[PDB]
Amino acid sequence: PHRYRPGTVALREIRRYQKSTELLIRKLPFQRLVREIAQDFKTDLRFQSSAVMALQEACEAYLVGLFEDTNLCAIHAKRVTIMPKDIQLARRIRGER
Amino acid sequence: ARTKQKPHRYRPGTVALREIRRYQKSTELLIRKLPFQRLVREIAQDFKTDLRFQSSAVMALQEACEAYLVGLFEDTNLCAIHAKRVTIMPKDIQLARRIRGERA
Amino acid sequence: KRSRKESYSVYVYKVLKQVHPDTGISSKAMGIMNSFVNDIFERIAGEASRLAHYNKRSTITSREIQTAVRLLLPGELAKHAVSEGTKAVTKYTSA
Amino acid sequence: KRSRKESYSVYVYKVLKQVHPDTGISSKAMGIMNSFVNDIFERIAGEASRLAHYNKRSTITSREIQTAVRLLLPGELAKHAVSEGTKAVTKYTSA
Amino acid sequence: RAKAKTRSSRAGLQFPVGRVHRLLRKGNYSERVGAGAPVYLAAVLEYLTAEILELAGNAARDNKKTRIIPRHLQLAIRNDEELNKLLGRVTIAQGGVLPNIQAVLLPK
Amino acid sequence: KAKTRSSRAGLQFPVGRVHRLLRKGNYSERVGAGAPVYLAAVLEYLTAEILELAGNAARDNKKTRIIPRHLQLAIRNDEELNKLLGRVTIAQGGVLPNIQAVLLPK
Amino acid sequence: VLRDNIQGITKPAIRRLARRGGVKRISGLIYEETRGVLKVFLENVIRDAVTYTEHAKRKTVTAMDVVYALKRQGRTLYGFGG
Amino acid sequence: VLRDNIQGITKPAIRRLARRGGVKRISGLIYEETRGVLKVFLENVIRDAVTYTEHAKRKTVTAMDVVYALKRQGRTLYGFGG
């Protein structure tokens, strides 16, 4: 049948998800995770809707930026695949670690 | 369960490591005072003419510059090792500065 | 709710209407612009207060604001912003 | 005649003679220590003022200082610093 | 008493000089606040907002739309040099990202 | 017969001077009674911490007087202080001896 | 008492976040790394948000607390009030 | 006048700065790059120092102007006053 060579659909997805502005993580799992994390600093906490929306926005921005830096470190080493050492280098240079 | 409760020559790279130790032990400034002072004066002159500098001002500038460059070289060395090299090249400086956010 | 929430919506709308006569603006974009205005305001004000503390002064003047604008904005932006500010002040005092 | 330059030299020397009773200190090191004290003071005071602004209060109390310490210092530094501040305030008000 | 004329109308501005004055006073910046400080600050703020709004409106009209959305503000900010340097550490809600693909990832 | 406030609290740092710096610094319209006491206490704590680490660094170097190199060693060798002073340059402090593993000969 | 909840950040969502970043090929071990870094970032922000909230003597976390906790880390966020 | 002077930052000095950074082998083209980046950093700092100085209506650049211009870029410097 009709198949696409490996990478074609990847470029299509890159264009499609760079053309859009919507969120990329589901809201309910992220909300559960945020509540579980906050369960350690204080019990019986309540969140507004906008608080969780803001947290999701900030987290997605952070992760997208990190992936750009990681792709840079991957192209530096004459590679196309990103690997965990790329993330570690990008975070070390940034000053996070 | 647990209950666990014929003239001597050093091989290329030796003097480099000796120098690395020597200059990571020390604390002096590694640039000469006079050329750095002249450079600072030229720059500030093309900003605003007829300027004067206290000595401690140029000393502060030299300290800040050297600290900046040492940090940049550390990051460059990591970016060189990442690509399986030992030699640092300009593209490593560019990558480190781009990731830090100083250029892009 | 008795409390009132002053914002910059009406002024941003006046600016927009003189810049682009027939272009509206969404509510989310208006919130973006509100946050932008507040952020830049407090940046300039904080820098002005600092460089008035350095010089043992008590008053925040046009000079402090001009120097804060020169310290915070990049080149061309700072040049044009200084032009606008001085024009406004000279038109004001001669009124 | 030229004015007086207040600093923290004598209090730093007292603290040093308490921890290490027989080691001196240089002059450039004392300069570093004065700069450190000033920097940390400014950081905590700025955070406390921001906190008092957010909550529409017009007073800086030990509660604001404590929250600013919790926000600024990392890890166990925060625990020990809060212990010290609380002990000192309790001893001061008991008299 | 003479007929009131506001301070913004005297300076020839669209932003409020009185409100900016009151915010500078109440903000604990200095014990006294001059007379031209609010005029200067208002003119600067108006200039900056007009700049961003013009850029965003152009970006929207180039997309064949009539109204500005946060995507247009993001596209306007990230495509300018000095504006991008002034707002480099700012996240804009629902703004997205700038489309670019590295040259080695492309086919062939 | 007039005691000081730092002596009433049991400190070495001055409470009156910290109170004055808080007042004339344009931080708030009013300043409480225990804010300077709390602040002096935490300042003294941090001072003593870093000074103790630097004095140990000076002793193991066969010296009897603290220099900026010892302050740099003390700060950079501790994790919490390296987080607190991560974006600070100490004049004439040098660096930490560190050679990467792939550079050493083998 | 909520548990695990970190595998709710599925693999397709991370692949989408990478595609928006321009990545063409993705490894097999980056999902663990991304979950780890997301958890770290979230803890660092939520700690400060909760600190602000409890200083105000409230039990509800407002959006302003979040934007303040973000601003204090150099991650200013426009469009949510302020 | 005071023209040239950027070649006054000689090659041995840059080699020393690299050795203190831990570098074992150095290329041939990094000296140009280092001179460029040093010049950029210096202009960015000196512009602000001179701005402070001329706001104070002085003709001499004090060390406090330099430490302020550095502090305003996240490069705090201890030991020179302040």
PDB file of N, CA and C in Angstrom, chain E residues 6-71:
ATOM      1  N   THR E   6      -7.625  68.747  31.668  1.00  0.00           N
ATOM      2  CA  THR E   6      -6.852  67.722  32.340  1.00  0.00           C
ATOM      3  C   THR E   6      -5.385  67.840  31.948  1.00  0.00           C
ATOM      4  N   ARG E   7      -4.529  67.137  32.688  1.00  0.00           N
ATOM      5  CA  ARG E   7      -3.097  67.265  32.446  1.00  0.00           C
ATOM      6  C   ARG E   7      -2.674  66.553  31.171  1.00  0.00           C
ATOM      7  N   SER E   8      -3.277  65.401  30.878  1.00  0.00           N
ATOM      8  CA  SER E   8      -2.987  64.720  29.624  1.00  0.00           C
ATOM      9  C   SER E   8      -3.321  65.592  28.428  1.00  0.00           C
ATOM     10  N   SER E   9      -4.463  66.274  28.460  1.00  0.00           N
ATOM     11  CA  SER E   9      -4.832  67.133  27.343  1.00  0.00           C
ATOM     12  C   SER E   9      -3.867  68.302  27.204  1.00  0.00           C
ATOM     13  N   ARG E  10      -3.274  68.744  28.313  1.00  0.00           N
ATOM     14  CA  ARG E  10      -2.253  69.782  28.232  1.00  0.00           C
ATOM     15  C   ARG E  10      -0.991  69.260  27.570  1.00  0.00           C
ATOM     16  N   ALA E  11      -0.506  68.099  28.006  1.00  0.00           N
ATOM     17  CA  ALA E  11       0.681  67.518  27.395  1.00  0.00           C
ATOM     18  C   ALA E  11       0.423  66.981  25.995  1.00  0.00           C
ATOM     19  N   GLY E  12      -0.835  66.799  25.611  1.00  0.00           N
ATOM     20  CA  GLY E  12      -1.147  66.243  24.310  1.00  0.00           C
ATOM     21  C   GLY E  12      -0.999  64.742  24.230  1.00  0.00           C
ATOM     22  N   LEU E  13      -1.444  64.020  25.248  1.00  0.00           N
ATOM     23  CA  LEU E  13      -1.258  62.583  25.347  1.00  0.00           C
ATOM     24  C   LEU E  13      -2.605  61.875  25.390  1.00  0.00           C
ATOM     25  N   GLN E  14      -2.546  60.545  25.332  1.00  0.00           N
ATOM     26  CA  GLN E  14      -3.716  59.690  25.465  1.00  0.00           C
ATOM     27  C   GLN E  14      -3.707  58.842  26.723  1.00  0.00           C
ATOM     28  N   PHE E  15      -2.619  58.841  27.470  1.00  0.00           N
ATOM     29  CA  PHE E  15      -2.540  58.111  28.720  1.00  0.00           C
ATOM     30  C   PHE E  15      -2.760  59.055  29.901  1.00  0.00           C
ATOM     31  N   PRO E  16      -3.155  58.532  31.064  1.00  0.00           N
ATOM     32  CA  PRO E  16      -3.550  59.410  32.175  1.00  0.00           C
ATOM     33  C   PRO E  16      -2.344  59.877  32.976  1.00  0.00           C
ATOM     34  N   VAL E  17      -2.118  61.186  32.994  1.00  0.00           N
ATOM     35  CA  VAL E  17      -1.013  61.712  33.781  1.00  0.00           C
ATOM     36  C   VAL E  17      -1.368  61.716  35.260  1.00  0.00           C
ATOM     37  N   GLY E  18      -2.634  61.980  35.587  1.00  0.00           N
ATOM     38  CA  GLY E  18      -3.039  61.991  36.983  1.00  0.00           C
ATOM     39  C   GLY E  18      -2.941  60.628  37.637  1.00  0.00           C
ATOM     40  N   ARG E  19      -3.413  59.593  36.949  1.00  0.00           N
ATOM     41  CA  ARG E  19      -3.338  58.249  37.505  1.00  0.00           C
ATOM     42  C   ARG E  19      -1.897  57.789  37.654  1.00  0.00           C
ATOM     43  N   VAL E  20      -1.046  58.112  36.679  1.00  0.00           N
ATOM     44  CA  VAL E  20       0.363  57.748  36.776  1.00  0.00           C
ATOM     45  C   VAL E  20       1.026  58.477  37.936  1.00  0.00           C
ATOM     46  N   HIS E  21       0.694  59.753  38.122  1.00  0.00           N
ATOM     47  CA  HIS E  21       1.180  60.495  39.278  1.00  0.00           C
ATOM     48  C   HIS E  21       0.796  59.807  40.576  1.00  0.00           C
ATOM     49  N   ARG E  22      -0.472  59.423  40.701  1.00  0.00           N
ATOM     50  CA  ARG E  22      -0.935  58.805  41.938  1.00  0.00           C
ATOM     51  C   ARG E  22      -0.279  57.451  42.162  1.00  0.00           C
ATOM     52  N   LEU E  23      -0.046  56.693  41.089  1.00  0.00           N
ATOM     53  CA  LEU E  23       0.634  55.412  41.239  1.00  0.00           C
ATOM     54  C   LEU E  23       2.081  55.591  41.666  1.00  0.00           C
ATOM     55  N   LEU E  24       2.779  56.579  41.104  1.00  0.00           N
ATOM     56  CA  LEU E  24       4.141  56.869  41.541  1.00  0.00           C
ATOM     57  C   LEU E  24       4.173  57.267  43.008  1.00  0.00           C
ATOM     58  N   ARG E  25       3.229  58.105  43.437  1.00  0.00           N
ATOM     59  CA  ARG E  25       3.156  58.467  44.849  1.00  0.00           C
ATOM     60  C   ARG E  25       2.954  57.237  45.719  1.00  0.00           C
ATOM     61  N   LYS E  26       1.870  56.504  45.490  1.00  0.00           N
ATOM     62  CA  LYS E  26       1.513  55.375  46.336  1.00  0.00           C
ATOM     63  C   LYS E  26       2.460  54.193  46.210  1.00  0.00           C
ATOM     64  N   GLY E  27       3.383  54.203  45.261  1.00  0.00           N
ATOM     65  CA  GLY E  27       4.216  53.038  45.084  1.00  0.00           C
ATOM     66  C   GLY E  27       5.447  52.945  45.947  1.00  0.00           C
ATOM     67  N   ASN E  28       5.697  53.924  46.816  1.00  0.00           N
ATOM     68  CA  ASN E  28       6.884  53.939  47.676  1.00  0.00           C
ATOM     69  C   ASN E  28       8.165  53.930  46.852  1.00  0.00           C
ATOM     70  N   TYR E  29       8.307  54.917  45.974  1.00  0.00           N
ATOM     71  CA  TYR E  29       9.514  55.008  45.165  1.00  0.00           C
ATOM     72  C   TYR E  29      10.446  56.098  45.666  1.00  0.00           C
ATOM     73  N   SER E  30       9.892  57.222  46.098  1.00  0.00           N
ATOM     74  CA  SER E  30      10.666  58.314  46.660  1.00  0.00           C
ATOM     75  C   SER E  30       9.706  59.186  47.441  1.00  0.00           C
ATOM     76  N   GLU E  31      10.246  59.925  48.408  1.00  0.00           N
ATOM     77  CA  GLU E  31       9.373  60.672  49.301  1.00  0.00           C
ATOM     78  C   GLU E  31       8.720  61.852  48.589  1.00  0.00           C
ATOM     79  N   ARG E  32       9.315  62.336  47.506  1.00  0.00           N
ATOM     80  CA  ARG E  32       8.712  63.380  46.695  1.00  0.00           C
ATOM     81  C   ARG E  32       8.744  62.989  45.226  1.00  0.00           C
ATOM     82  N   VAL E  33       7.784  63.503  44.467  1.00  0.00           N
ATOM     83  CA  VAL E  33       7.653  63.202  43.049  1.00  0.00           C
ATOM     84  C   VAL E  33       7.477  64.511  42.301  1.00  0.00           C
ATOM     85  N   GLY E  34       8.330  64.752  41.316  1.00  0.00           N
ATOM     86  CA  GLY E  34       8.318  65.994  40.583  1.00  0.00           C
ATOM     87  C   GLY E  34       7.034  66.195  39.801  1.00  0.00           C
ATOM     88  N   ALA E  35       7.055  67.222  38.958  1.00  0.00           N
ATOM     89  CA  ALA E  35       5.891  67.552  38.148  1.00  0.00           C
ATOM     90  C   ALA E  35       5.954  66.934  36.759  1.00  0.00           C
ATOM     91  N   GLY E  36       7.130  66.908  36.145  1.00  0.00           N
ATOM     92  CA  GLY E  36       7.279  66.341  34.824  1.00  0.00           C
ATOM     93  C   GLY E  36       7.541  64.863  34.779  1.00  0.00           C
ATOM     94  N   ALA E  37       7.745  64.225  35.924  1.00  0.00           N
ATOM     95  CA  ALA E  37       7.953  62.779  35.928  1.00  0.00           C
ATOM     96  C   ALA E  37       6.746  62.010  35.410  1.00  0.00           C
ATOM     97  N   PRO E  38       5.506  62.297  35.831  1.00  0.00           N
ATOM     98  CA  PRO E  38       4.375  61.567  35.249  1.00  0.00           C
ATOM     99  C   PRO E  38       4.155  61.871  33.783  1.00  0.00           C
ATOM    100  N   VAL E  39       4.422  63.097  33.339  1.00  0.00           N
ATOM    101  CA  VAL E  39       4.266  63.424  31.924  1.00  0.00           C
ATOM    102  C   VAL E  39       5.259  62.632  31.090  1.00  0.00           C
ATOM    103  N   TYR E  40       6.516  62.610  31.526  1.00  0.00           N
ATOM    104  CA  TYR E  40       7.537  61.836  30.835  1.00  0.00           C
ATOM    105  C   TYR E  40       7.165  60.362  30.780  1.00  0.00           C
ATOM    106  N   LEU E  41       6.781  59.792  31.921  1.00  0.00           N
ATOM    107  CA  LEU E  41       6.481  58.367  31.961  1.00  0.00           C
ATOM    108  C   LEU E  41       5.256  58.029  31.125  1.00  0.00           C
ATOM    109  N   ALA E  42       4.245  58.894  31.127  1.00  0.00           N
ATOM    110  CA  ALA E  42       3.062  58.636  30.322  1.00  0.00           C
ATOM    111  C   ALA E  42       3.385  58.681  28.839  1.00  0.00           C
ATOM    112  N   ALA E  43       4.198  59.651  28.412  1.00  0.00           N
ATOM    113  CA  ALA E  43       4.551  59.720  26.999  1.00  0.00           C
ATOM    114  C   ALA E  43       5.348  58.499  26.573  1.00  0.00           C
ATOM    115  N   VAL E  44       6.238  58.019  27.439  1.00  0.00           N
ATOM    116  CA  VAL E  44       7.027  56.838  27.097  1.00  0.00           C
ATOM    117  C   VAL E  44       6.132  55.611  26.976  1.00  0.00           C
ATOM    118  N   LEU E  45       5.226  55.422  27.935  1.00  0.00           N
ATOM    119  CA  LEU E  45       4.322  54.276  27.878  1.00  0.00           C
ATOM    120  C   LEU E  45       3.455  54.315  26.628  1.00  0.00           C
ATOM    121  N   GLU E  46       2.928  55.489  26.288  1.00  0.00           N
ATOM    122  CA  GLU E  46       2.116  55.606  25.087  1.00  0.00           C
ATOM    123  C   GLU E  46       2.913  55.252  23.845  1.00  0.00           C
ATOM    124  N   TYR E  47       4.158  55.723  23.761  1.00  0.00           N
ATOM    125  CA  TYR E  47       4.986  55.392  22.607  1.00  0.00           C
ATOM    126  C   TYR E  47       5.162  53.886  22.472  1.00  0.00           C
ATOM    127  N   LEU E  48       5.485  53.214  23.577  1.00  0.00           N
ATOM    128  CA  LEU E  48       5.743  51.780  23.497  1.00  0.00           C
ATOM    129  C   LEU E  48       4.497  51.004  23.086  1.00  0.00           C
ATOM    130  N   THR E  49       3.347  51.323  23.686  1.00  0.00           N
ATOM    131  CA  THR E  49       2.135  50.600  23.315  1.00  0.00           C
ATOM    132  C   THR E  49       1.780  50.838  21.857  1.00  0.00           C
ATOM    133  N   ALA E  50       1.940  52.069  21.374  1.00  0.00           N
ATOM    134  CA  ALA E  50       1.624  52.330  19.976  1.00  0.00           C
ATOM    135  C   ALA E  50       2.527  51.525  19.055  1.00  0.00           C
ATOM    136  N   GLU E  51       3.802  51.391  19.420  1.00  0.00           N
ATOM    137  CA  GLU E  51       4.723  50.586  18.625  1.00  0.00           C
ATOM    138  C   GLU E  51       4.243  49.145  18.515  1.00  0.00           C
ATOM    139  N   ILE E  52       3.983  48.517  19.665  1.00  0.00           N
ATOM    140  CA  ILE E  52       3.578  47.113  19.645  1.00  0.00           C
ATOM    141  C   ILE E  52       2.254  46.937  18.921  1.00  0.00           C
ATOM    142  N   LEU E  53       1.311  47.851  19.130  1.00  0.00           N
ATOM    143  CA  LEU E  53       0.003  47.702  18.506  1.00  0.00           C
ATOM    144  C   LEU E  53       0.092  47.844  16.999  1.00  0.00           C
ATOM    145  N   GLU E  54       0.930  48.754  16.504  1.00  0.00           N
ATOM    146  CA  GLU E  54       1.103  48.872  15.061  1.00  0.00           C
ATOM    147  C   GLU E  54       1.684  47.593  14.476  1.00  0.00           C
ATOM    148  N   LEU E  55       2.732  47.061  15.109  1.00  0.00           N
ATOM    149  CA  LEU E  55       3.313  45.816  14.611  1.00  0.00           C
ATOM    150  C   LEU E  55       2.285  44.690  14.594  1.00  0.00           C
ATOM    151  N   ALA E  56       1.539  44.530  15.686  1.00  0.00           N
ATOM    152  CA  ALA E  56       0.580  43.436  15.774  1.00  0.00           C
ATOM    153  C   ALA E  56      -0.553  43.603  14.775  1.00  0.00           C
ATOM    154  N   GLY E  57      -1.020  44.833  14.567  1.00  0.00           N
ATOM    155  CA  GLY E  57      -2.062  45.052  13.582  1.00  0.00           C
ATOM    156  C   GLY E  57      -1.605  44.722  12.178  1.00  0.00           C
ATOM    157  N   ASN E  58      -0.363  45.072  11.843  1.00  0.00           N
ATOM    158  CA  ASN E  58       0.166  44.679  10.542  1.00  0.00           C
ATOM    159  C   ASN E  58       0.220  43.163  10.418  1.00  0.00           C
ATOM    160  N   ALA E  59       0.688  42.486  11.469  1.00  0.00           N
ATOM    161  CA  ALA E  59       0.778  41.028  11.421  1.00  0.00           C
ATOM    162  C   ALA E  59      -0.596  40.389  11.275  1.00  0.00           C
ATOM    163  N   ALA E  60      -1.617  40.991  11.881  1.00  0.00           N
ATOM    164  CA  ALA E  60      -2.966  40.454  11.757  1.00  0.00           C
ATOM    165  C   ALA E  60      -3.518  40.671  10.359  1.00  0.00           C
ATOM    166  N   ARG E  61      -3.372  41.884   9.826  1.00  0.00           N
ATOM    167  CA  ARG E  61      -3.886  42.164   8.489  1.00  0.00           C
ATOM    168  C   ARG E  61      -3.180  41.317   7.439  1.00  0.00           C
ATOM    169  N   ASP E  62      -1.902  41.001   7.656  1.00  0.00           N
ATOM    170  CA  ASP E  62      -1.212  40.115   6.727  1.00  0.00           C
ATOM    171  C   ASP E  62      -1.762  38.698   6.792  1.00  0.00           C
ATOM    172  N   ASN E  63      -2.470  38.358   7.864  1.00  0.00           N
ATOM    173  CA  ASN E  63      -3.108  37.062   8.009  1.00  0.00           C
ATOM    174  C   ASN E  63      -4.571  37.100   7.583  1.00  0.00           C
ATOM    175  N   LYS E  64      -5.016  38.224   7.019  1.00  0.00           N
ATOM    176  CA  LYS E  64      -6.384  38.385   6.525  1.00  0.00           C
ATOM    177  C   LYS E  64      -7.404  38.228   7.647  1.00  0.00           C
ATOM    178  N   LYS E  65      -7.197  38.966   8.733  1.00  0.00           N
ATOM    179  CA  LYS E  65      -8.134  39.018   9.842  1.00  0.00           C
ATOM    180  C   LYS E  65      -8.400  40.470  10.204  1.00  0.00           C
ATOM    181  N   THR E  66      -9.383  40.671  11.073  1.00  0.00           N
ATOM    182  CA  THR E  66      -9.826  41.999  11.468  1.00  0.00           C
ATOM    183  C   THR E  66      -9.522  42.325  12.918  1.00  0.00           C
ATOM    184  N   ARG E  67      -9.292  41.319  13.748  1.00  0.00           N
ATOM    185  CA  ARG E  67      -9.141  41.495  15.179  1.00  0.00           C
ATOM    186  C   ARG E  67      -7.814  40.898  15.624  1.00  0.00           C
ATOM    187  N   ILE E  68      -7.225  41.471  16.665  1.00  0.00           N
ATOM    188  CA  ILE E  68      -5.914  41.041  17.134  1.00  0.00           C
ATOM    189  C   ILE E  68      -6.073  40.016  18.249  1.00  0.00           C
ATOM    190  N   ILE E  69      -5.315  38.929  18.162  1.00  0.00           N
ATOM    191  CA  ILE E  69      -5.347  37.846  19.144  1.00  0.00           C
ATOM    192  C   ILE E  69      -3.931  37.641  19.669  1.00  0.00           C
ATOM    193  N   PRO E  70      -3.731  36.967  20.806  1.00  0.00           N
ATOM    194  CA  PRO E  70      -2.372  36.876  21.365  1.00  0.00           C
ATOM    195  C   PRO E  70      -1.352  36.263  20.426  1.00  0.00           C
ATOM    196  N   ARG E  71      -1.786  35.433  19.483  1.00  0.00           N
ATOM    197  CA  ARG E  71      -0.864  34.903  18.487  1.00  0.00           C
ATOM    198  C   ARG E  71      -0.226  36.025  17.688  1.00  0.00           C
TER     199      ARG E  71
END
